[PDB]
């Protein structure tokens, strides 16, 4: 387990994101794994059927050094710790970071806090 996603706004139960460590070192590309967050149920993490959220809304990327990056690819925006991030621009995530989507319509707001499993980096 790489990290736990805690949805603070109540729409989604606790979910953990995983990645086989042996195979992660077997891979060459500077980006080891990608988890997609979006309205499309094919995504790794489903954000729910909220029309203003993108089918593929944001990505969390596992870098070569056990680090996690946030990448926004949405139409309406992604917020990190209360600030709208630049689209298509990798942002390094830190423990307890809060990722918010749906800003602009109260009924659509969804906030998620990331809890990183330090045991995973150490296995790296």
């Amino acid at each position: 387990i790489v990290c736990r996603v805690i949805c603070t706004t109540g729409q989604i139960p606790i979910r953990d994101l995983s990645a086989d460590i042996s195979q992660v070192l077997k891979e060459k590309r500077s980006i080891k794994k990608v988890w997609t967050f979006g309205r499309n149920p094919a995504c790794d993490y489903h954000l729910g059927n909220i029309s203003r959220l993108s089918n593929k809304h944001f990505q969390i990327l596992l870098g070569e050094d056990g680090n996690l990056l946030l990448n926004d690819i949405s139409t309406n925006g992604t917020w990190l710790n209360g600030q709208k991030v630049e689209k298509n621009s990798n942002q390094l995530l830190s423990q307890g970071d809060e990722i918010t989507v749906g800003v602009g319509v109260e009924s659509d707001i969804l906030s998620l806090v990331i809890f990183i499993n330090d045991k995973f980096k150490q296995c790296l």
Binding site: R39, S51, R52, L53, N55, T75, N76, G77
Partner: peptide
Amino acid sequence: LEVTEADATFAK
């Protein structure tokens, strides 16, 4: 494949 509803005038 339902296309996303886009913020326009009130986009952030």
